[PDB]
Amino acid sequence: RVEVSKVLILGSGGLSIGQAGEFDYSGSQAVKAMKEENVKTVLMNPNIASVQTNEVGLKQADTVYFLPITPQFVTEVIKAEQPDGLILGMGGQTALNCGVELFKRGVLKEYGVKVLGTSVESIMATEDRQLFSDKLNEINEKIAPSFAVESIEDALKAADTIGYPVMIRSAYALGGLGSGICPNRETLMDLSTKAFAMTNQILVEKSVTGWKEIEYEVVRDADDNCVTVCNMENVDAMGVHTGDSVVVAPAQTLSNAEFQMLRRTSINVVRHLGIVGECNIQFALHPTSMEYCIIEVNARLSRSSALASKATGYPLAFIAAKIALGIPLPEIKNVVSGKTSACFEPSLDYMVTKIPRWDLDRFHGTSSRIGSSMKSVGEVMAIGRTFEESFQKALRMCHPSIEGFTPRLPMNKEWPSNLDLRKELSEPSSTRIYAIAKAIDDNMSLDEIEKLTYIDKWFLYKMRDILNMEKTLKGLNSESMTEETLKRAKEIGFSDKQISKCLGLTEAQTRELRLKKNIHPWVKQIDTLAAEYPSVTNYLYVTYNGQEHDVNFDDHGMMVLGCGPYHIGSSVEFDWCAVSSIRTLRQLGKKTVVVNCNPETVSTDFDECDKLYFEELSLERILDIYHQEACGGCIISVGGQIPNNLAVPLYKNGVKIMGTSPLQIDRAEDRSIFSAVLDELKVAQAPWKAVNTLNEALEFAKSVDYPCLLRMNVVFSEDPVVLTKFVEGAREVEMDAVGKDGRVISHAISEHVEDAGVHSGDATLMLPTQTISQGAIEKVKDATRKIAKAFAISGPFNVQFLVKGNDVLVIECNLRASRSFPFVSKTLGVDFIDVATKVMIGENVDEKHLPTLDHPIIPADYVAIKAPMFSWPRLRDADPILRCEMASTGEVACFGEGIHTAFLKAMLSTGFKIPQKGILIGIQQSFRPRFLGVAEQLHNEGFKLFATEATSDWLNANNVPATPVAWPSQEGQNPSLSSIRKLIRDGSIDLVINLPNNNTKFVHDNYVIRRTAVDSGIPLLTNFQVTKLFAEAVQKDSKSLFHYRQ
Amino acid sequence: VLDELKVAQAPWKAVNTLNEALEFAKSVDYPCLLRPAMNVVFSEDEMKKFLEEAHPVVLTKFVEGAREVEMDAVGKDGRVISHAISEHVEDAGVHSGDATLMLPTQTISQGAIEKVKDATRKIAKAFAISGPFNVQFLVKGNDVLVIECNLRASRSFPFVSKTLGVDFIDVATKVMIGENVDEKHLPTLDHPIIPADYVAIKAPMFSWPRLRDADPILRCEMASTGEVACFGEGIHTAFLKAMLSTGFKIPQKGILIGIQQSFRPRFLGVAEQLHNEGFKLFATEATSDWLNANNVPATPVAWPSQEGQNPSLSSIRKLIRDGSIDLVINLPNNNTKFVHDNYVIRRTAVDSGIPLLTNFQVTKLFAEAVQKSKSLFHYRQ
Ligand SMILES: Nc1ncnc2c1ncn2[C@@H]1O[C@H](COP(=O)(O)OP(=O)(O)O)[C@@H](O)[C@H]1O
Ligand SMILES: Nc1ncnc2c1ncn2[C@@H]1O[C@H](COP(=O)(O)OP(=O)(O)O)[C@@H](O)[C@H]1O
Ligand SMILES: Nc1ncnc2c1ncn2[C@@H]1O[C@H](COP(=O)(O)OP(=O)(O)O)[C@@H](O)[C@H]1O
Ligand SMILES: CC(=O)N[C@@H](CCC(=O)O)C(=O)O
Ligand SMILES: CC(=O)N[C@@H](CCC(=O)O)C(=O)O
Ligand SMILES: [Cl-]
Ligand SMILES: [Cl-]
Ligand SMILES: [K+]
Ligand SMILES: [K+]
Ligand SMILES: [K+]
Ligand SMILES: [K+]
Ligand SMILES: [K+]
Ligand SMILES: [K+]
Ligand SMILES: [Mg+2]
Ligand SMILES: [Mg+2]
Ligand SMILES: [Mg+2]
Ligand SMILES: [Mg+2]
């Protein structure tokens, strides 16, 4: 047993595509393990929305630093905290790369900090693709023909030796960053160039596109006991990243010989690699032989370990962390069985399906095709006891518009008239599942579909079974459908909505019809051992394929609904809110029932509540569960949009909703009612109107002046739909609050850096406010007092405001927790959700020390700043520019004595890197009056300035020196001018400032400049306010919230 | 006392030598205030030549680019039971009494207000205040520094009292003679009174025409001879009414602009704005080139010291007399090169009876406010 008294754990930082909440979940389990063994813990994670970073409970570190996960800052923390252990395996690639850099530099050795678990040597051997190859060649393991190279010239050579097509995949990365299939020389040139901006080594590898992709989660302790805890079969074949793949567990199409060969190879490889803890391993398996290739091992917790932990009920991260302290597997309890050890390989008597969630329509430049580089923003997991059951649930979980497996597209989009169905099947995309449905419907053979998609035909048989049931049901009605048929339809995952559309009924009618035949689902436990030993816990799912329930229904607990899959605009903040509520209920001795389907969340960790249903967040299924438990009530206000949109339907189906009435939530989401209420209260708002005609539109827009918002999209010229006056030059303010009986008993006001026009979630937030008049604050407060009263609010809510001097206008009101609730709560040292939860269930509340409207809590000695995270490099060709639709994928927050410090810390936490070289400046003409001073300031700080044609003339005319550069569209047409690509490549330029607006003339050229920066991996600033503040802040530490709160 | 209370203030020191002076000014950076006639200096040389004309001298770090805030308050047994915070339009450097005051504050961070308040709580207690007092603050972001404290009623007590509808002196007088006081409806530190539906602006009055040959320009020593105040739904309206109340007359014709080079980055937008409102712009040599180089049309004019030496350029006296120019904007600073010429421009406006703006912040706010009959009692309803 390793002796350690204080451990530092690293988080992932802000969430980004491929590096999501799985590490909040993992790292929380790690801290719990550490505490059980009396080990003091320090956490570094700038992701303020993470549950990890909370102060209270058995999973909370003793000390929390909201700082960049970079060697500079981790060093400062080490110095100050003098830890003797380091966990670097539970923060994705961020934490891994940071820890390897520290190691390489000898910082760990210098301060006596032991890496707990898998060594940096084992890590390097799995992250460096060449070292990996060397290791497997030592044991004559099987890999594909490949060469690890460090230049574009060497990659070309490797590809000619191997033969096209080839896959390139980066070292020291995850989620397929910089990766891609290359059918030819030119594709290889394009991609390797882009890959080298983000890594120093790529592997050029013979293609095994189409082989089956099989994963194992492997555990190995310090006694050399080594087991495979889970195995997953990817439904989409090799070539679609595991993360963007449909995946099933356990495997369905392997023989014992295949499954055991790969299992034993996993164990050998993991052993040889010196791994201690957990890891993930990937194989390519030939579809019609025993031939296989080992692709990669991830010597760290992963999105695959999170998934496996939920699928199996085996908590891999918890176990990993105990193992990192030298405790062997036989000495660690299986917490689910309560009577056995963690030395085993679970047995599942059910099948789970994970499907990804994409959000791509908003990024016009990025295709919906998927491949080796992840593009999904979330995932779901469904459990069933038939593939079909598991599979249709999982499809419904991805997005409310999806009904199951149908030949219809999501978002109610029609198929294009120029559809090439074969192309869709052969070229994976975010919508290929529905294209398969369509093809099966249109009588393409299953054999040809397997041939084009590479999806194993077995899975296709199941899909055909589903569509045959749809045909059968369509020919029936409420009188003609038998009990035998309904039962079967449910047993293969048909919802009542899907059935209703076949039968010619409403969903309610169909629910009634079903219950009238006493056809209902059954509640079953995940016990890890397929019933060999009974479960002491209640980790539950629901299935039509059983004849009994595995538990009683005597608790009558309080239901809390979770967030569903993360997607853009809906992230881990909504797991924070939900978990805060779950913990508050527990702390008050109330029985809890949780329903959520997101494998990455701490809300779907069974140790947080009395009953966890890992289930659909549908009306159908919530009703099933509520009525089966006879829950005392349901909280629908702490999991974002999904639960909130069920408020009225639930109300109407006998569900007791806690807090603010669903009647009030309806009133408030009704733009006309809401607006009329505001008029009554004398609360101002932007002029708006609903119209059906172009002439009404043009008349209204003329009557209030352009620009106008449109429902999202703004327009500035003449060259039903809701229209709203777009107010220019306006500040934006957030009010986050809790109501009790229509009174506000906690609140917090923050100011965006950016003017209205950048969406809340893409905005940078300052708390407390900075430039708002005191009279505006009074108006913001008075409008919030009246709104709370008008809608009898009892629970959390939020109101967004435009502010221009003393004009204060209401934009929107949301009668639920907003995404800024964690930021605000932690910053002010008050759990708004704890307060709100107590209001909603009638528990007492001392308002003396809360930030009521009458006695706000306003930090004096410090400020807090929240910055948005983006995933532009992974959204290939996307224009990295903020619209009225939101684009950020996560958030960070940092603290400082003042705004400049806090702002710099927040920005560094996003990956932004302070330029050491030249800055490129290109701005639309109208920004000149305000930008001149920003430019002088950058010049006076010593930055060499480059600029596009007109901007450079203008700077020089104002005695600010700038070197002009060429437009991309004009490279070669003037030999006096350097190309931007070349200046970036050479290292002359390491920050780009590009400020377009609606009157931008060179739209494409400026798009190319913006995208060049992203793809070269240098920072880009496209918002004037953010740019101003940056310039001010570089004009000139390692503290965090707890420092300032002292 | 402030150090004990942990309340910040500008570095300062009393000295009896030139070498102590220079050492200190070097140790905190120029510029520095000087009290031996208050006076600022920006260099080693500028100082030597001020002292060699004036027994110790107090030196204070002059904080540039800073907001200034007034706290007017009443204490009872060291607690604050009435208070009011106002922000100057002008940056610190223009004296309180020459400053234009906004109530409530407009551009101050909420954290700074909390600091202003906390410092006032501690000061009232440290000096066992029972009566009226005032504290002046520098504010720069969240740095809040105390300038001075006056243990008496300040000149902004009427403004503040009438604006908030509370006689601060009536309250203070009761405290001082031991009469009872209901604090429930007073603006205590814990429950301020902050106008939501209106703002108040106080503007200084000057008597430049009667001070023959006086340079009409604000120093650290004060020059105003009275005050007016007006009210509005917002700042622009209130500000225009206050300015009109001083005798300022909104230009109907051309505007003459001459500014020290360093104001250019900030002034560009002020100038574009005046141009977009339709004002014809005139300017001194360098300022006119610069405006035109930035596609803001201006007609150059001659320096007074050079009238006749270029027939392409009109004299300013003649453009004023002809009625082409009815507002002058002149913004000098320590680096102004044509000190006399710009003095003559400023004094020509005064003696022609046309309005003159010499402060950047006031000039900015003006330009914003011309972009487009009520009084306090209207708004208090
Ligand atoms: N040689 C190959 N031929 C075809 N596809 C491949 C090959 N190697 C990897 N892939 C695909 O690329 C994905 C990313 O590769 P991986 O080595 O797992 O990198 P990462 O660590 O970035 O996920 C794999 O899951 C798989 O779908
Ligand atoms: N009247 C307006 N003028 C200018 N910007 C606006 C206006 N209304 C909304 N916006 C911008 O659009 C964003 C989204 O508006 P909101 O009503 O919150 O939409 P959503 O339904 O996406 O929450 C706001 O956060 C704001 O920055
Ligand atoms: N440290 C400083 N930095 C910048 N300006 C200052 C500073 N101290 C004072 N001032 C300016 O000087 C003015 C007068 O200061 P004060 O000490 O109140 O002098 P008086 O004796 O004239 O009241 C203030 O109102 C402010 O505008
Ligand atoms: C970003 C932007 O709008 N740029 C300017 C170009 C100005 C320049 O020539 O530098 C445009 O009008 O396209
Ligand atoms: C007021 C002032 O300082 N003027 C500038 C000149 C401006 C001009 O020539 O246009 C000066 O240095 O005197
Ligand atoms: Cl929200
Ligand atoms: Cl006074
Ligand atoms: K796959
Ligand atoms: K790896
Ligand atoms: K993986
Ligand atoms: K797209
Ligand atoms: K039918
Ligand atoms: K001032
Ligand atoms: Mg990997
Ligand atoms: Mg991988
Ligand atoms: Mg919103
Ligand atoms: Mg004074």
Numbering used by the authors:
A (entry chain A): 419 to 1129, 1139 to 1146, 1163 to 1479, 1484 to 1493
B (entry chain B): 1095 to 1130, 1138 to 1155, 1162 to 1479, 1485 to 1493
Paper's wording?
CPS1 is a complex multidomain enzyme having two separate active centers that catalyze a three-step reaction involving two highly unstable intraenzymatic intermediates and intermediate migration between both active centers. Bicarbonate is phosphorylated by one ATP molecule (ATPA) to give carboxyphosphate, which is then attacked by ammonia, yielding carbamate, which is phosphorylated by another ATP molecule (ATPB) to produce carbamoyl phosphate. The CPS1 monomer presents the previously inferred 6-globular domain architecture, with 2-domain and 4-domain respective N- and C-terminal moieties that correspond, respectively, to the small and large subunits of bacterial CPSs (these are heterodimeric, intrinsically active and NAG-independent CPSs), with an extensive interface of ~2400 Å2 between these moieties.
